[PDB]
Design a protein around this ligand. Sequence first.
Ligand SMILES: CC(=O)SCCNC(=O)CCNC(=O)[C@H](O)C(C)(C)COP(=O)(O)OP(=O)(O)OC[C@H]1O[C@@H](n2cnc3c(N)ncnc32)[C@H](O)[C@@H]1OP(=O)(O)O
Ligand SMILES: [Zn+2]
Length: 254
Amino acid sequence: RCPSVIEFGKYEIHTWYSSPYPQEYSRLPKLYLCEFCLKYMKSRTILQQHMKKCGWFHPPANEIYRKNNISVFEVDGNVSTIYCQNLCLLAKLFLDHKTLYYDVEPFLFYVLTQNDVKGCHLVGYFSKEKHCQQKYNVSCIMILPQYQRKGYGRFLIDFSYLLSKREGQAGSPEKPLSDLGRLSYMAYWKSVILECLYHQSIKKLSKLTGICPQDITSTLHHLRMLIRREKLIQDHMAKLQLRPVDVDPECLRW
Ligand SMILES: CC(=O)SCCNC(=O)CCNC(=O)[C@H](O)C(C)(C)COP(=O)(O)OP(=O)(O)OC[C@H]1O[C@@H](n2cnc3c(N)ncnc32)[C@H](O)[C@@H]1OP(=O)(O)O
Ligand SMILES: [Zn+2]
């Protein structure tokens, strides 16, 4: 409800939840954000004056992944604090609960961009705690509405496990999951398991995949495979081939 709509580059985005934008922006139906620095402003003309002095065309961070027109920037909440606070405020417009927006230091932010001649456009992000005893490989994940349901969410989840695999660890998303988070991960874990079985132990599956034992076990249970169900494997393999956004591990500079 507050705010209700944002203008974000060429996009009008309807918000899902309130976000605690600093007072006088918390009481505004519409916000105008710079698409590259995520600064919030109260009018189109103020945004237009800002685009004239803002020099950013991408996130203020190292690009750790690029393939064709897709990039991932690794942003450190300890270094690019303002930007990461602006990103958390944006994210909260599509999250029912987030931790308070100005403690970003404990996190790294993996920012997804679709790139063209006008720059690297924010699609979404996942955050990740630098030091985490629960071994959560994602704390938060968000794809902007205008890009939702195109495979960007799965790509990011896939990308989160590639980091896990490269740190020599199995990882898991932070719980509680939102309903949308639950559907996304379930959809991801099923397809990874079905595809691996098509192309092939739970501990071995865990090592190849970076998905933790718990999530494999419960996904296997959900599929009543905890035991190969050939019909289900074949049908999924037919569903696939019927993933244009897809992680290539060799494109990782990390
Ligand atoms: C770890 C956590 O913190 S949980 C928090 C999760 N994040 C949020 O709730 C923020 C708001 N939601 C979002 O940002 C997104 O919905 C995400 C990140 C969860 C998923 O992003 P998307 O880009 O939509 O992902 P993608 O297109 O890869 O879809 C993944 C699966 O979720 C399904 N899905 C996506 N949106 C919806 C929806 N509105 N209703 C039901 N299912 C949906 C897709 O159909 C797909 O399942 P399928 O393969 O069985 O069809
Ligand atoms: Zn800007």
